[PDB]
Amino acid sequence: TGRGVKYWFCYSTKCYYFIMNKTTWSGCKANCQHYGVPILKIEDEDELKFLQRHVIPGNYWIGLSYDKKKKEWAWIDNGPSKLDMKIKKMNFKSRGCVFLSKARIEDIDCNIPYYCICGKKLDKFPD
Amino acid sequence: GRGVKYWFCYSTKCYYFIMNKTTWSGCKANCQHYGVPILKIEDEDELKFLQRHVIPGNYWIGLSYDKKKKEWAWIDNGPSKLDMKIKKMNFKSRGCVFLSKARIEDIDCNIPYYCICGKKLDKFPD
């Protein structure tokens, strides 16, 4: 048995898991659930840039996917994000998913084996 | 009496930044009130990160001169990897230590400065 190679890291009032095995997007969603820390939602450009400065060079699935039934992009939580403005002006073509790299965010086939970022807001100071 | 305060985590630690000004020991006492002891800094990477993050000012940390046994000591009475660096700064041996963006320094403990509390996380916050 196993699960893979991951580390965790906090920043501001949020913590993340960077899962350093290449899985499909769905697998990334899956793995993140298994730790109760869901696939990453990015709130703003400050957080995006922090992640890109942080990340070891690679490609990381995040919780933004194409809704096949609705014909719209969707975060893991179905909430809006302050990236949406920029994102919708980024004209994502593929009916696929979204990853980040140190350089940017892009859209590609959800079956591509990439790394994976899980994220979760802290509700209170950790005790 | 309490006032302005925020917390922030980085890597595997979280900190409180208490922004009313108090003596060193008021910092020690206020950090305890929140169950997060006055900051102990582990190494130079941590000190640097804190200098970059902090709003310009002076902040008490859990390093004070121990009259009784004649040494600088951290809050938990343990060693820090930052110790060699500290002994090379030629502090006076008297009072307490505060951090600013440019440096850390010894001074009289009863100067009102701001305050940093720190706690190492031991598990992913649940």
CB nearest A125 (choices: B7, B11, B12): B7
B13 to chain A: nearest residue by CA?
A10
Shortest distance between the Cα of B95 and any Cα of chain A, in A, equals 30
CB nearest A10 (choices: B10, B16, B35): B10
Residues of A in contact with B7 (CB under 8 A): 13, 125
Experimental technique behind these coordinates: X-ray
Domain tally for chain A?
1
Q: Report d(CA A3, CA B111) in Å as an integer.
A: 52
Report the CATH number that the domain containing residue A32 is assigned in CATH.
Answer: 3.10.100.10
* Contact (CB, 8 A) for B57 and B114: yes
Cα B16 vs. chain centroid, distance in angstroms?
A: 10
Which residues, listed in sequence order, are joined to residue B65 by a DSSP beta bridge?
Answer: B72
- A-B contacts (CB, under 8 Å): 39
Show the domain range for A107. 1-127
Render A39-97 in DSSP notation, one character per residue.
BP---SHHHHHHHHHHS-SS-EEEEEEEETTTTEEEETTS---TTHHHHHTT---SSSE
Residue A46: which residues within 8 A CB-CB, separation 6 or more?
none
Q: Around Cβ B28, how many Cβ atoms within 10 Å?
A: 20
The torsion angles phi and psi of B123, rounded to 5 degrees, stand at -160, 160
Q: What's the reported resolution, in angstroms, to a tenth?
A: 2.6
